[PDB]
Design a protein around this ligand. Structure first.
Ligand SMILES: Nc1ncnc2c1ncn2[C@@H]1O[C@H](COP(=O)(O)OP(=O)(O)OP(=O)(O)O)[C@@H](O)[C@H]1O
Ligand SMILES: Nc1ncnc2c1ncn2[C@@H]1O[C@H](COP(=O)(O)OP(=O)(O)OP(=O)(O)O)[C@@H](O)[C@H]1O
Ligand SMILES: [Mg+2]
Ligand SMILES: [Mg+2]
Ligand SMILES: [Mg+2]
Ligand SMILES: [Mg+2]
Ligand SMILES: [Mg+2]
Ligand SMILES: [Mg+2]
Ligand SMILES: [Mg+2]
Ligand SMILES: [Mg+2]
Ligand SMILES: [Mg+2]
Ligand SMILES: [Mg+2]
Ligand SMILES: [Mg+2]
Ligand SMILES: [Mg+2]
Ligand SMILES: [Mg+2]
Ligand SMILES: [Mg+2]
Ligand SMILES: [Mg+2]
Ligand SMILES: [Mg+2]
Ligand SMILES: [Mg+2]
Ligand SMILES: [Mg+2]
Ligand SMILES: [Mg+2]
Ligand SMILES: [Mg+2]
Ligand SMILES: [Mg+2]
Ligand SMILES: [Mg+2]
Ligand SMILES: [Mg+2]
Ligand SMILES: [Mg+2]
Ligand SMILES: [Mg+2]
Ligand SMILES: [Mg+2]
Ligand SMILES: [Mg+2]
Ligand SMILES: [Mg+2]
Ligand SMILES: [Mg+2]
Ligand SMILES: [Mg+2]
Ligand SMILES: [Mg+2]
Ligand SMILES: [Mg+2]
Ligand SMILES: [Mg+2]
Ligand SMILES: [Mg+2]
Ligand SMILES: [Mg+2]
Ligand SMILES: [Mg+2]
Ligand SMILES: [Mg+2]
Ligand SMILES: [Mg+2]
Ligand SMILES: [Mg+2]
Ligand SMILES: [Mg+2]
Ligand SMILES: [Mg+2]
Ligand SMILES: [Mg+2]
Ligand SMILES: [Mg+2]
Lengths: 93, 46, 77, 102, 63, 18
RNA sequence: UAAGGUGAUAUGAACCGUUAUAACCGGCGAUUUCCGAAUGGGGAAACCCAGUGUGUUUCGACACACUAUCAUUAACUGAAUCCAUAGGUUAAUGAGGCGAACCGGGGGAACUGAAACAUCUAAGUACCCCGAGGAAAAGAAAUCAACCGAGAUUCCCCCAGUAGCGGCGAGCGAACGGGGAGCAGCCCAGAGCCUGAAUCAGUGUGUGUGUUAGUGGAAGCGUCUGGAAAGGCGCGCGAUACAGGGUGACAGCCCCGUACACAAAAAUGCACAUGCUGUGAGCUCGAUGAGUAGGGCGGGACACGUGGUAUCCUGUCUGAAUAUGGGGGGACCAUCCUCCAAGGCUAAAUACUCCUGACUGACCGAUAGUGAACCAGUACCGUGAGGGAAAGGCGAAAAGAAC
RNA sequence: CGAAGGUGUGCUGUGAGGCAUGCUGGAGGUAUCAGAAGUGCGAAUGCUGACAUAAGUAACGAUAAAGCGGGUGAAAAGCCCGCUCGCCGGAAGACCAAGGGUUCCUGUCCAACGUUAAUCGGGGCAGGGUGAGUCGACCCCUAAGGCGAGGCCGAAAGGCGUAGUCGAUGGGAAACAGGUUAAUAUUCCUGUACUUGGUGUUACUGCGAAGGGGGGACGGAGAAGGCUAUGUUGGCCGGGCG
RNA sequence: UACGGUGCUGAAGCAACAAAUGCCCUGCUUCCAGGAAAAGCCUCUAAGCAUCAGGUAACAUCAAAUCGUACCCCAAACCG
């Protein structure tokens, strides 16, 4: 949580779903895609330092990949971890 | 009517799981045979 | 197991032969007995699992001589 | 180590374009080359709205086997074979006839 | 040339270079996901450079 | 598109003793 | 080694190179999540939970390192119990698993044949277990011969389906001797006089020859048919290269290759030479493997099934001589020959092929050939061990059919 | 300037066969005489694949039951909306565990799948969706039982077992109501709480075990009494004068 | 206002009676077939500290990780 090297690989991408848009408008919560092995703590430190924003709490969930077919071949989407990071009141990104 | 297979993951892993098979040499010989045959799924563990 | 610690005698297998010469597999085991031999140099009793043939060789060879061979064999008396 | 390079001038040895001269454009790893405006084929290109909306009968160059073309001497006016030679420690190509370095 | 210059310097300069190099990679990853990055070849470039600098660091660390 | 076949068979009838 | 290239179905986008850091290929390294001998503890494999110590500080924590068991060795401590010993704690080492067949050893069937079936056969086979090497095992006569001699072991062809063994049934089946492949002999059981002699093992040091990338590599045009010429018909040329493959139909001369001739910064094999570190050569005088050989009993192995049955191994009970002495010569005795057990080591000829390269086939050509020419030990089936498929072909080029 | 194979025709030999030709097909084929065979198929309830037959026949999975208007659509008995009717209601409702593993929600499409059609679907395709100091798992603790240093035993493999270490189906700290999404909520927002550790400050100070005791800690049946969930009625409030 | 919805406002919000297989009740009574364990927790002291450490109490403060969480679940989603 304290190493700048660990933090720079924790955040993978922002989530741009309809739920994420509602989160921007209603509860000032940012939805991110993080490393599958990441813990709520380190994620709070990385966002606080790399975005200069105050974080209230971070809840995480694991999304199970979907099973799809490419032609006649079976395949599976990868599992990923979704983090709901709630920013302190007032601050905006 | 109650059919023969009543699934249970804990029972399934404790009976035929990788660690149950490898506990004894005879089970380890099962793994050797399945490795020689080239099985994609060595044991029943997920 | 049933192995003599001096001579190394171990169970062997053979045939029960009847009057009709029927052969059935059997085992011959050594006449093993646990005995406490008095070793004078250490003023101690050391217990060994020996056969009756092993007991005879201990008298002939001396208690100290056999133990020296045992240490070379690494039998951990 | 390749006898035919990107900018070489060649003459077609076999096919419907026998005797025609052209300039190589692309050398494909499959042992085929694309020559500028030689082996024209009319491809029925389906229209794509995202880009190149108007699809019509399009004339483009098709790949030709390297064995089916030969380098053009441009001095004797005939097809020639390529050899290799070390001149100043660098391997260069020369025409088999009249053995002059390219 | 890049590898040569890396070795020439010292550990401290290299560490500053690694952190700076990684920072554009993190920035590039964000632009890539947001659809704002049109020059996609830098993503592979910085990844190789990160590997190159770390390789020189191990070489210059005695072992 | 992945059809198959299976047969186990069973045995029963009446008597033929007269 | 290079003018192209970002592995495939598989395009596309955004690019990176073009005379040499693009790519690709070889050598040597760097990194190598988690499970798996799994080794910090546990565990429903790819997960859960730590301890110690070093170092970091934003005082929330964080990062490395170590911590399995067993064997051997050495220290330190440490009972009953005075010394001791057991035990205990550390530290260095080795091991642990995996893998096709071949090999040695420890165990070890039955079906079947006998036209049934017990001895016997199948067979010391299948199978289980331990162990090891590139080979293993065996091996330097207590061996054979026959009054002449040979001179370790192993393997091949004979001897020979002979001599024998055998409910003398089924069946099993030598040896002596000969011709070959290959040959190699030594050490301890002890001390001197000489002396480090030969020889062997470590290692460097060169030379030679390979291996791991590679390089160059001769000579054909015209015309005819044809969608296309490599085919037909003419006239040439190369060949230490007319092995093959590809190219729009069948190519010595279009292309890749072939014969050829070459190539190594670095790593490595092999062999010779050579330098160090061990290692002991020679001579004289000694010594000469004891609960052993043999025997009784019960089995096993010898082709040999207890038979008149030698020889070998021993579970059991006994038990010598020891060079002025013992073993063997197929019961046994005498004579005579021959050898010296109860301690060890040893290359080659031999067996096998998971794997690598090249090449070959009166071998197969998709219901064949591996189960699998195709994303096959897959789909599927079964709790599981395990079972286990089907499925190749547009055309030269996708030019894969705009409208 | 048309190979093999395929399909006709003609001729020919005592036969197995042979020769040649028209057509398809598109590239092989191969005399003679010798040689070697996985050398000739109608049968084996043969094997594999394909295709018939019965046959447009049986059947289309509980006799709880359907009907209509409107809409969308190329097309509506089956889909959507609406109004009726009927069935279950100690279930045919609601929430879970086990087990399954995206079947959940939205858009789009009708090849295959649905025993019919299908615009629909638990079908295809593309996106989205599960948020926990107080819920579980995990963690601490043990039952049966498993494994098991050393140890005992056993041809080998191994068997048994001590200290230990695992193993819930049992024992251990703590969260409720309201609101909100197309799909999540004791997990998310609002309001109001609670628990166990770490650190610091202050004050007062006997602490301390792998020990000891208590507690945890426990059956069957039966009998009431006091309560709550919950229901009924009245009152109250709003609406109604059929 | 997009049939949704969204925003605002919002009365009474009591009593009696009946009533569990749910709670007091891990109780009480009775019986014979005589009805887990351990840890957390409370307490007691050994050795080893008793200035310390540690304990108690009050504030302030940090921390509570990781994993499941959709949906079906007497069924068209499980075993047939
Ligand atoms: N005590 C022994 N032990 C073993 N072998 C021996 C013994 N004596 C002699 N031999 C051998 O027997 C042979 C000589 O036989 P013999 O005993 O009659 O003569 P010797 O004089 O005793 O022997 P040597 O000359 O060696 O001393 C030699 O090969 C010798 O090696
Ligand atoms: N039984 C075989 N199995 C496989 N390949 C074989 C066999 N026999 C021969 N070959 C092939 O034959 C090749 C050798 O044949 P061969 O030596 O007789 O040719 P050559 O022309 O006579 O040469 P030269 O005259 O120099 O001896 C082998 O390299 C091998 O590829
Ligand atoms: Mg969670
Ligand atoms: Mg070349
Ligand atoms: Mg581990
Ligand atoms: Mg373990
Ligand atoms: Mg557990
Ligand atoms: Mg260790
Ligand atoms: Mg093994
Ligand atoms: Mg018989
Ligand atoms: Mg080896
Ligand atoms: Mg003898
Ligand atoms: Mg004799
Ligand atoms: Mg002797
Ligand atoms: Mg075919
Ligand atoms: Mg096949
Ligand atoms: Mg046949
Ligand atoms: Mg037929
Ligand atoms: Mg017939
Ligand atoms: Mg029939
Ligand atoms: Mg038939
Ligand atoms: Mg078929
Ligand atoms: Mg009909
Ligand atoms: Mg009918
Ligand atoms: Mg009818
Ligand atoms: Mg009918
Ligand atoms: Mg029905
Ligand atoms: Mg209608
Ligand atoms: Mg229709
Ligand atoms: Mg009803
Ligand atoms: Mg009711
Ligand atoms: Mg009822
Ligand atoms: Mg579940
Ligand atoms: Mg699906
Ligand atoms: Mg749905
Ligand atoms: Mg249908
Ligand atoms: Mg669907
Ligand atoms: Mg043990
Ligand atoms: Mg439970
Ligand atoms: Mg919250
Ligand atoms: Mg009430
Ligand atoms: Mg009841
Ligand atoms: Mg739910
Ligand atoms: Mg729901
Ligand atoms: Mg049903």
């Amino acid at each position: 949580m304290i190493r700048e090297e660990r933090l720079l690989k924790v955040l993978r991408a922002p989530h741009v779903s309809e739920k994420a848009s509602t989160a921007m408008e209603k509860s000032n919560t940012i939805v991110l895609k993080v490393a599958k092995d990441a813990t709520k703590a380190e994620i709070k430190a990385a966002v606080q330092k790399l975005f200069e924003v105050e974080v209230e709490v971070v809840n995480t969930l694991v999304v199970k990949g979907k099973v799809k077919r490419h032609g006649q071949r079976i395949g599976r989407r990868s599992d990923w971890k979704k983090a709901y990071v709630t920013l302190k009141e007032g601050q905006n990104l | 009517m109650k059919r023969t297979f009543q699934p249970s993951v804990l029972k399934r892993n404790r009976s035929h799981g990788f660690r149950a098979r490898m506990a004894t040499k005879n089970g380890r010989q099962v793994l050797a045979r399945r490795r020689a045959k080239g099985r994609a799924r060595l044991t029943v563990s997920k | 197991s049933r192995v003599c610690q001096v001579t190394g005698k171990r169970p062997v297998t053979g045939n029960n032969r009847s009057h009709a010469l029927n052969a059935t597999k059997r085992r011959f085991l050594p006449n093993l007995h646990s005995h406490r031999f008095w070793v004078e140099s250490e003023k101690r009793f050391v217990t060994l699992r020996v056969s009756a043939k092993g007991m005879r060789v201990i008298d002939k060879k001396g208690i100290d001589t056999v133990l020296a061979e045992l240490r070379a064999r690494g039998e951990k008396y | 180590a390749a006898k035919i390079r990107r900018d070489d001038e060649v003459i077609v040895l076999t096919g419907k374009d026998k005797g025609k001269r052209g300039k190589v454009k692309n050398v494909l790893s499959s042992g085929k080359v694309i020559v500028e405006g030689i082996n024209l084929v009319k491809k029925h290109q389906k229209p794509v709205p995202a880009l190149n909306q108007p699809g019509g009968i399009v004339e483009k160059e098709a790949a030709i086997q390297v064995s089916n073309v030969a380098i053009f001497n441009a001095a004797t006016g005939k097809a020639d074979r390529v050899g290799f030679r070390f001149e100043d420690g660098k391997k260069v190509r020369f025409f088999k006839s009249n053995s002059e370095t390219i | 040339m890049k590898a040569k210059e890396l070795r020439e310097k010292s550990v401290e300069e290299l560490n500053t270079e690694l952190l700076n190099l990684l920072r554009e990679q993190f920035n590039l990853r964000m632009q890539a996901a947001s659809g704002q990055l049109q020059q996609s070849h830098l993503l592979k470039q910085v990844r190789r450079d990160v590997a190159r600098v770390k390789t020189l660091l191990n070489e210059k660390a005695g072992a | 598109x992945x059809x198959x076949x299976x047969x186990x068979x069973x045995x029963x009838x009446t008597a033929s003793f007269v």
